[PDB]
Write a protein that binds this ligand. Sequence first.
Ligand SMILES: Cc1nc(Nc2ncc(C(=O)Nc3c(C)cccc3Cl)s2)cc(N2CCN(CCO)CC2)n1
Length: 287
Amino acid sequence: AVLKFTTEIHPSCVTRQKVIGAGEFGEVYKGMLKTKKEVPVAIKTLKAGYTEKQRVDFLGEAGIMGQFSHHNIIRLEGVISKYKPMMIITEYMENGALDKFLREKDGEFSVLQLVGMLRGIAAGMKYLANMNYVHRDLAARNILVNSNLVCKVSDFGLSRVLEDDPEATYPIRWTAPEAISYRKFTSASDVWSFGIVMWEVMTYGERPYWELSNHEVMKAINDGFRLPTPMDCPSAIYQLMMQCWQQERARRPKFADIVSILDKLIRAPDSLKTLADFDPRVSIRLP
Ligand SMILES: Cc1nc(Nc2ncc(C(=O)Nc3c(C)cccc3Cl)s2)cc(N2CCN(CCO)CC2)n1
């Protein structure tokens, strides 16, 4: 039923040009779509021999995305299902995944730009939550960035989301305690993950909890430790991420609250000049 909302695209309208992602059962390409001149698109394929579950999971991502229409959610152009290999075609995000982007652009943005990226992510997440969609895998690696610096939530589906992410192990350090301990994934566990994303953005893609093992992370969280403030981080931003990490689900902000706060800070940007204290890990003394 959900696929009837998607446009079926003829293969002659699609040219794959360059591989930008890859796995065992398909690749992601940058390419062009010619329905105006040709427009750039991203193209994900599913290779022949796929199972019934793989087909349901693959087209299910497109079916979910076709239900959404929001500035901060990746837009679906259409699908190729009548021909093989099958494909999903979306808008092309020129700057790729947010985690890699920030690590390759360390120090290159203003604090206001970084906070603007978080407001966009939060707006997309508010929309998903209100559409009754729990993401389960919110992380900077699953946000895409375009040439306007707009961040859009990516990576949709059911079981395929955690199955396909190599960070998800039998990822812990993005996941709220109740989701780990008793499998309770909700929009409030997505808020926990969003707090981790805030820390990823403000640190230019530092890995959460550094080299602590998964067990060490869980033990630290259960004992009350939390990630320390990033360098040069507005106090209001650190306070907000901390509240995303409340152990008690009910004490966490909703995405509605997050969007409202971030919007107010951006609209009075001097509010971002007050920085949380950074605890230095190296002492440099000079006479
Ligand atoms: C991984 C990656 N993606 C990029 N853009 C994308 N746009 C949309 C994507 C996407 O996957 N759509 C999608 C599809 C198609 C189906 C189902 C679901 C979805 Cl969400 S991927 C750009 C990019 N690069 C550009 C910048 N380079 C800098 C050098 O380091 C690095 C590589 N790399």
